[PDB]
Design a protein around this ligand. Structure first.
Ligand SMILES: *P(=O)(O)OC[C@H]1O[C@@H](n2cnc3c(N)ncnc32)[C@H](O)[C@@H]1O
Ligand SMILES: *P(=O)(O)OC[C@H]1O[C@@H](n2cnc3c(N)ncnc32)[C@H](O)[C@@H]1O
Ligand SMILES: [Zn+2]
Ligand SMILES: [Zn+2]
Ligand SMILES: [Zn+2]
Ligand SMILES: [Zn+2]
Lengths: 311, 305
């Protein structure tokens, strides 16, 4: 039977309206991002290893940026100042992120952190969205493995909503709701520093959140040990998704603190990584209301995903 | 042109603008009624020769059987289907303004039935046309979903329009002619490309009178709206090569307070389906719109039918 559920992190109701194990995907050899072709890319910010011609990753400016870094002094309407960068995740054209080894994924995570720390030097930036698209229908335009970073001059709606809901919950219980993840959501897998779950009031079917076990407000406070540990758990979730759902397109999104987060917000602000496989679309109900309809309960997603074997 | 962020009290969120070239028998058929979930009413009333029918959805997202039961709440609600034509190949926009009016008056009838239930707080009337816009059936139809809660866009709209009214003493949709980019105008309605439109070629149809509730619509305004809706849908079809689309009626919460009425003003939103989203939108709840509403209005004002 259908149910509405709410969670402080989304701060909204979702409708659950249902077999879970019957859910499946319904979806060049070179390119400018390939090693050797660097002059065909927008300006480089840095690579790993540093200035090594034999690079493992590169962070570059987006050639078609959504926001303009040249509008900084200019700052109903505000100017479209921001940063839009691309993280090229492999020198090799055909390797997908989930095929990269945990240490290599750790290096990407650490590169997000290095770049965030660079952007955080600009007072005009209020939030940085790190995200990945895999698959045309999940918004990828390039087949080569990569992810993107968009730095914004405003705190966007999800972040505002999250701050509001987590604050209300903290005032109500004295607790950070993500510190309570193992009792509040449905655990899937656990690594040394992170736990993956099917979110109690998940927006999307087979949505998974990977959540630091320690209270951590900022993604970019990640260290190298946590990075490789997170890399391994991210890899695992992506490979279980790819097996269970027949390699669907997907997106992942890092949800982190605003750059000007206040001391008072710290106790209930806890970063996490959201993975959303693309399984279904929306129509007029969701557009009209901002309420989603999820056909699979998280109880059931967790059961399924815990039983996934990769051998 | 140069990117820009824009906000509107109605959405109460920033959108990033970052830029004429933009482009895209069954069980509901007259003679197949026993094959549907229970009929609620039809038009003409009890006429075997129906022009529209309002039925229960066969696969409802919320359960009408959970009313007595009501971080979790029971999935009580009403999920209904409005069948807009007895004829299988007719699209909504092909219907004459009066017939579209009838459909709008039927939405009104059904809202007033639903509003008799204290457990309902908001009713979303919406249409999907085309598989990729969420349609599962090609016969012309729209839907209504009655909810036990006020959903996020409605809460956001109430907040944003409240803020604006507190700062200006004005209802922002009452000023639509000076705030938004006018496309067409009827006797009681105006259609605009919204200043801070979420989606490329989004169009709002706004009542010119300050009207808080859709369902206070009368017969004259229904036919007037019908003709303007038809005009926008036909212009969209022609300019954008008949894309799939959605429309959504934005209206007041059923338990709206007196103090909310001065800045609460219903409207109808039309979204041609032209593009999709990626991790930026999912992560932030901020959209990126490739066409300024200035350019949309200019293109749309020139469409010849
Ligand atoms: P994914 O498909 O999520 O995003 C790809 C982004 O890469 C940008 N882009 C395309 N081509 C180039 C070059 N040559 N250099 C730098 N950036 C590039 C697109 O604008 C996408 O946003
Ligand atoms: P559109 O494609 O937006 O939505 C169609 C809705 O109609 C419901 N439905 C399908 N078939 C039937 C019957 N035989 N009776 C009543 N309702 C029906 C689908 O569940 C869609 O919600
Ligand atoms: Zn390549
Ligand atoms: Zn915490
Ligand atoms: Zn039919
Ligand atoms: Zn008004």
């Amino acid at each position: 039977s259908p149910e509405l559920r709410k969670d402080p992190v989304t701060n909204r109701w979702v409708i659950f309206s249902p077999r879970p194990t019957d859910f499946k995907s319904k979806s060049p050899s070179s390119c400018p991002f390939c090693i050797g072709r660097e002059q065909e890319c927008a300006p480089e910010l840095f690579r790993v290893p540093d200035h090594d011609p034999n690079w493992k990753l590169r962070v570059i400016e987006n050639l078609y940026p959504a926001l303009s870094r040249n509008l900084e002094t200019q700052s109903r309407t505000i100017v479209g100042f921001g940063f839009h960068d691309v993280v090229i995740e492999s020198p090799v054209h055909s390797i997908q992120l989930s095929d990269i080894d945990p240490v290599g994924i750790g290096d990407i995570l650490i590169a997000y952190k290095k770049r965030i720390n660079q952007i955080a030097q600009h007072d005009s930036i209020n939030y940085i969205q790190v995200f990945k698209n895999q698959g045309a229908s999940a918004g990828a335009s390039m087949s080569h493995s990569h992810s993107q970073m968009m730095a914004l001059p405003v705190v966007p709606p999800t972040v505002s909503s999250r701050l509001d809901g987590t604050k209300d919950y903290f005032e109500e219980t004295g607790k950070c709701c993500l510190c309570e993840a193992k009792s509040k959501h449905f655990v899937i897998d656990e690594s040394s520093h992170f736990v993956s779950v099917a979110p109690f009031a998940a927006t999307y079917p087979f949505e998974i959140w990977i959540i630091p076990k320690d209270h951590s407000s900022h993604f970019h406070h990640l260290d190298d040990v946590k990075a490789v540990d997170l890399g391994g758990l991210l890899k695992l979730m992506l490979q279980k998704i790819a097996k269970q759902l027949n390699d669907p397109p997907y997106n992942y999104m890092i949800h982190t603190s605003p750059l000007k987060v206040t001391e008072s917000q710290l106790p209930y602000t806890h970063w996490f990584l959201q993975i959303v496989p693309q399984l279904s679309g929306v129509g007029g109900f969701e557009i009209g209301t901002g309420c989603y309809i999820n056909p699979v309960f998280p109880e059931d997603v967790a059961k399924v995903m815990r039983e996934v074997s990769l051998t």
